[PDB]
Design a protein around this ligand. Structure first.
Ligand SMILES: Nc1ncnc2c1ncn2[C@@H]1O[C@H](COP(=O)(O)OP(=O)(O)NP(=O)(O)O)[C@@H](O)[C@H]1O
Ligand SMILES: Nc1ncnc2c1ncn2[C@@H]1O[C@H](COP(=O)(O)OP(=O)(O)NP(=O)(O)O)[C@@H](O)[C@H]1O
Ligand SMILES: Nc1ncnc2c1ncn2[C@@H]1O[C@H](COP(=O)(O)OP(=O)(O)O)[C@@H](O)[C@H]1O
Ligand SMILES: Nc1ncnc2c1ncn2[C@@H]1O[C@H](COP(=O)(O)OP(=O)(O)O)[C@@H](O)[C@H]1O
Ligand SMILES: Nc1ncnc2c1ncn2[C@@H]1O[C@H](COP(=O)(O)OP(=O)(O)O)[C@@H](O)[C@H]1O
Ligand SMILES: Nc1ncnc2c1ncn2[C@@H]1O[C@H](COP(=O)(O)OP(=O)(O)O)[C@@H](O)[C@H]1O
Ligand SMILES: [Cl-]
Ligand SMILES: [Cl-]
Ligand SMILES: [Cl-]
Ligand SMILES: [Cl-]
Ligand SMILES: [Cl-]
Ligand SMILES: [Cl-]
Ligand SMILES: [Mg+2]
Ligand SMILES: [Mg+2]
Ligand SMILES: [Mg+2]
Ligand SMILES: [Mg+2]
Ligand SMILES: [Mg+2]
Ligand SMILES: [Mg+2]
Lengths: 236, 224, 229, 216, 227, 216
């Protein structure tokens, strides 16, 4: 009765992970700016819908929904259509253009409930939470958001949602995650890197850990192309 | 594909696969004397001269007098463009002796019908001690308004190591759509300038570092 | 070996009893420190599991991170049925994990140890209760009250701790090596895009032991260590 | 109308800077201890007086005027003679062996009094940035061409002390004294000259009986 | 008298050669090193050899470990410390943390030295006493008060303390500022995946010594160096 | 009339400093523990007395006078005799088991003993910089030639501990004890001498029964 996995259908990832992401748990995807974390979290939901008719909920802390949609057009992923069809729900949690300092955790209490009803309403099995770093920066990484983040993770587990959460790190080789996000999103960790090779950049993906199950180890090269992420498990 | 505006900075539109996405902001970050101000001036100058797209330059530390003077190093006559109403330099530099400023920047953009905006040294208004939440929200307020207005913006930021964080306060990469890094790396005893587009949302682009020079004609980048 | 001063119990974790020259010192505590995903929880589960299966020695597992349910689910990765051992009274999993929405815990632990007549104890991620900037004196005294009680009871204890870098301090709070009798380090070193797992016994009070790093794997049978020499 | 420059006449520097220091602006000269900062700032003034009859003001915060004068004897320069002729003024802003608005109009008074064209100023990051910003602006309005020295503690670390001084400076020169394999090597770099060209990278120099000698 | 400082033999094989005669008499020597380098072993061997070889009584002040554990672990080297305690030649002074006023502590150390007529003293884990008071400079020059007082009685003292890196600062918390006369560094260096133990005498005020690192092993007879 | 020097009579040191230590000024001697700083400062005073009959004052903050005397017996030097003769004074400022008060004690000793040589053995950087500058300023005003030691943590790292001590000193000497391949190598470097020339980089030295011997 060891943990089962959900296929991401992201080229090469299901091989590295030996079958996909552990079902009903959160996986942290951490990486410097521009490593492809958001793209990964979108491809996860998009493939869920197209391949499996599994609805997805995308919670956005950094980008607006309109920009999420616009930026995916270059891959030929018609997110607007999936939203119109009710297969994808983009929950806008991104900063107020007229944002001010507010007190409490009522806003993140209401967020978790908003996320829960979205999941219920759209019958979603897949969830992406994009840019945990950003909501941490909204509350100066106070123990208030740390607690709420933990509450969010537990609720998702309680719901049975399979979740990707993305988060920033500052160096290619250094800590797993800025603000130690892996403490709360702790079951599974994937690290994306964008490493200088001479003057060129080489992207790699690593599954550092998946609790309760097996996976390939170390870094595997990938590219981002017109079809999104392509990872090469046998790549040079 | 998303619509891009040509910078006409030699080499840059090839590296960005057509120029800067219209209606969005781009961070240009670098150590001192890497060519950030020059990039942001050239962006406006070319827009006016080649495409008749008016420009607003917001300066937070250099005075407009020095901006105009330093631009004559490249044979650019910015005073003439200001006299013609094609360029507006907005002085936000401090007296030797931000919400409000945002409305003034809005006003200038509509008044001059500007499509291009450059913001130089905006983080000099903050202080080392400020909470990241405050710095981020105050910067975001400005950038969100520019996006709402339709402007395409270059915003310069500072860094203190050539390989190290993107910018000084650790929030700047979250407020802009795109990220460009200018470097000035020591190789033995020689300096080499490079430009890298680190992040360009919604499009492919050339990756890694590309050498450039600053000459009498401004920035020239060599992608091959 | 016969001629060493400290009595030891066998972990039965393949290769560890060779590296430690007989197993873990009885009645004492052993720190197992490592970056995240090095095998700390697996080591501390395997210790209890083997004690029950091989020697019928009951065990108490104190969890600060994972829920008991997840401990049990994850252990199925290795074909271990922990729920059955809990139902039989041979294993007790003590939940000290964060509630969504230390003296007290010590008494609960002591009660569980006497109730289940446990000889083996694993404390997993105890330093997760502390805050990053809590005083060193505070963290050391808190850990020590726990560990001294366990020694007084006569339990043999594995206590896991976190570290941030593979080559760097023994543990995160810089006091952990002072409350423990023995120190073991698990590493997961990344070099040339490949990871390799190793185990080292850094300090074992009162006896010799093999020195340096030894390779190990995690497979469907748990930890396997390969001691060369 | 691109910025004009003033010749330093420091052997090799006017080649590296394509003509000297930008007129009416301040140039930061930063370096670890004993890199030659005070020497550069004195040669600047000295050559101004001797070669071009341009009066100079030297602002000192730690070294006494007499120590400054004494040390310049090392290079065969008679500063006391120039002070007696009124072609050099050393301004003593040192503390006593038991507020920059004040110091500034002291400098300004001295500039107007001695008809000075060259100034040298020898030796919480938010407040330093703002304070150096204001000092730079005040000298610019007076029309002085200024060398200001600053300290740093590593050869390839921060340019100055707080990581901000280089950003608020129009011009930046870095003096290094790098230790490699038990040997020292002095170099000068013009890192930035806003609004004009200059040679790039480090150039070796020596300090001898004649002052700084740079080899382009 | 009017002579250079004299030394007392440790009888730790190899060490009396490296130190040209032993530890400077009537002064403190800091022995620093990462966890598990052999500091406590050095400090016990020093006292044990004094008792067995010279009939010089010893006092062992313990800040980290319990006396029961110190005695039990010393059996690893064939040393019967309980017998020496029973015979009054060794006193172990317990200052380890309670499982639940340092001026008073110094006075008890003094009293013990006088009661047992000890000529050798070991102070184990200065780092630990620092962690109990959070490196407040109340512990720091209460430490100097201890070093001073030891020097007044003419005790010859080993003080052990922790460091974090093999090639980095001499001692965590800057302990070498107080136990400043003599400094010995024990290292456990990683050579690939193997460990190599070394001992260095960094400094002995007022006298000569060999320089750099010397490898050693820990055996069933304690520390064994070879120059 | 450039700055003159007084001989240390460590023959290698007077060779690389071209004559000795600059007269009437303070020289910072920095190094990790056990590099020979105290020995350098004592040898400076001892040679001054034995070779030139220049009395000396040694100011101690850590070691007791009795220990300074005992330790010097390692080199066959009888400092108790020199104290008894009134050629040397060891001023005890070490703590029991106010910068102005210390300075007046130093001044009083220099007058009492007619001393020409002084050695001084051993939070905010601003405070340190200002106190150290006042100490240095008074000694210079008194006429003393001073060696002042400081500690540092790394062989190749900051010169002293507050990042300011080296900028307040006229002269800087760095002692190193570098560990490489399990062996130690001692070196001495004159980093800076204001107003005068000197050899550059690291020079090997040893400490023997004879004290410091430098071998260019
Ligand atoms: N005509 C020219 N020819 C060559 N290089 C020039 C010319 N004019 C200016 N420069 C260079 O351009 C640099 C100034 O670039 P600038 O855009 O001011 O940099 P920055 O990154 O904004 N630096 P700062 O804001 O001062 O930290 C100077 O340091 C010169 O090296
Ligand atoms: N006649 C000379 N020949 C050679 N070198 C000399 C001569 N006179 C002085 N020097 C050198 O000049 C250096 C002093 O330069 P100086 O301009 O005082 O440096 P600085 O960078 O201002 N140091 P500081 O202000 O104390 O941090 C000395 O350390 C000597 O190495
Ligand atoms: N059509 C495309 N082809 C290739 N690369 C693309 C395309 N669209 C976007 N990208 C790349 O994706 C990057 C942004 O990925 P994203 O997932 O937003 O990064 P982050 O890790 O910062 O979340 C851009 O910097 C660009 O390099
Ligand atoms: N059946 C299996 N085969 C191989 N590896 C496994 C298996 N089950 C778990 N693992 C590995 O064990 C690791 C779990 O380690 P864990 O003990 O939870 O680490 P820690 O407690 O140090 O964070 C996983 O990250 C995974 O790599
Ligand atoms: N009989 C023995 N043979 C070899 N090594 C031993 C023996 N007994 C103990 N040890 C070693 O002694 C080390 C502990 O020494 P200790 O002096 O307590 O270290 P420290 O005080 O520096 O942490 C143990 O980690 C083990 O390596
Ligand atoms: N007779 C001697 N022969 C060789 N070396 C000696 C002699 N006497 C003392 N030393 C050395 O001098 C060093 C003491 O130097 P010292 O000036 O006290 O160092 P610091 O003040 O830099 O800590 C001792 O560590 C020892 O190596
Ligand atoms: Cl790619
Ligand atoms: Cl260039
Ligand atoms: Cl493995
Ligand atoms: Cl030179
Ligand atoms: Cl050994
Ligand atoms: Cl030597
Ligand atoms: Mg993203
Ligand atoms: Mg600029
Ligand atoms: Mg674990
Ligand atoms: Mg100077
Ligand atoms: Mg010990
Ligand atoms: Mg000393």
């Amino acid at each position: 009765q060891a943990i089962a996995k959900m296929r991401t259908m992201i080229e090469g990832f299901d091989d590295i992970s030996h079958g996909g992401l552990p079902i009903g748990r959160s996986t942290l995807v951490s990486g410097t700016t521009g490593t492809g974390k958001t793209l990964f979290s979108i491809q996860f939901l998009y493939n869920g819908i197209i391949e499996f008719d599994e609805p997805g909920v995308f919670v956005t802390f950094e980008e607006t929904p309109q920009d999420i949609i616009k930026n995916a057009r270059s891959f030929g992923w018609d997110l607007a259509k999936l939203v119109d069809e009710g297969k994808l729900f983009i929950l806008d949690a991104s900063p107020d253009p007229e944002g001010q300092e507010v007190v409490g955790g009522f806003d993140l209490s209401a967020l978790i409930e908003r996320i829960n009803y979205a999941i219920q309403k759209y019958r979603a099995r897949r969830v992406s939470i994009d840019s945990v770093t950003s909501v941490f920066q909204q509350y100066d990484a106070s123990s208030v958001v740390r607690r709420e983040l933990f509450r969010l993770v537990a609720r998702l587990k309680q719901i049975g949602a399979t979740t990707v959460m993305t988060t920033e790190r500052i160096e290619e080789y250094g800590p797993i995650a800025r603000y130690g996000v892996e403490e709360f999103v702790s079951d599974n960790v994937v690290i994306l890197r964008n490493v200088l090779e001479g003057e060129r950049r080489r992207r790699t993906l690593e599954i550092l850990k998946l609790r309760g199950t097996s996976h390939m180890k170390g870094e595997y090269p990938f590219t981002i192309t017109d079809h999104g992420i392509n990872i090469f498990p046998l790549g040079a």
